[PDB]
Ligand binder design. Structure first.
Ligand SMILES: [Ca+2]
Ligand SMILES: [Zn+2]
Length: 132
């Protein structure tokens, strides 16, 4: 198990969703763990961007996530937060997938509230972090 450290301090309005998203991911996968701490690998910011929330990342634990206010009020915020965090873990967007695929993100619409990765998503994250 590899530990990726994040900094949630610049997203004051989303502290509980970030904590919720990190726990979902920690309770779903074996080879990587997310923990809040100093000298962080990636960080969370918040504001307004009509394209919604996004991740600026190398796909292997680093960069930052921007959480948009309107998207997190119209869609379930834990799903939004957990989805964007999936990008930092290495998973790509797959907009045509169903609600049970966390990486389909907003594709299924606002009625989709599931913040959990499916079995294939979890399996792929374990493979991407198996050797660090
Ligand atoms: Ca929720
Ligand atoms: Zn995405």
């Amino acid at each position: 198990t590899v530990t990726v450290t994040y900094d949630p301090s610049n997203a004051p309005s989303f502290q509980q969703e970030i904590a919720n998203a990190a726990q979902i991911w920690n309770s779903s996968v074996r080879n990587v763990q997310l923990r809040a701490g100093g000298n962080a690998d990636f960080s969370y910011y918040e504001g307004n961007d009509s394209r919604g929330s996004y991740a600026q990342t190398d796909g292997h634990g680093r960069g930052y996530i921007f959480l948009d206010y309107q998207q997190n009020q119209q869609y379930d915020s834990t799903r939004v937060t957990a989805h964007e965090t999936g990008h930092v873990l290495g998973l790509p967007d797959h907009y045509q997938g169903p609600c049970s695929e966390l990486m389909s993100g907003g594709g299924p619409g606002p009625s989709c509230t599931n913040p959990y990765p499916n079995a294939q998503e979890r399996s792929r994250v374990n493979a991407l972090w198996a050797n660090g």
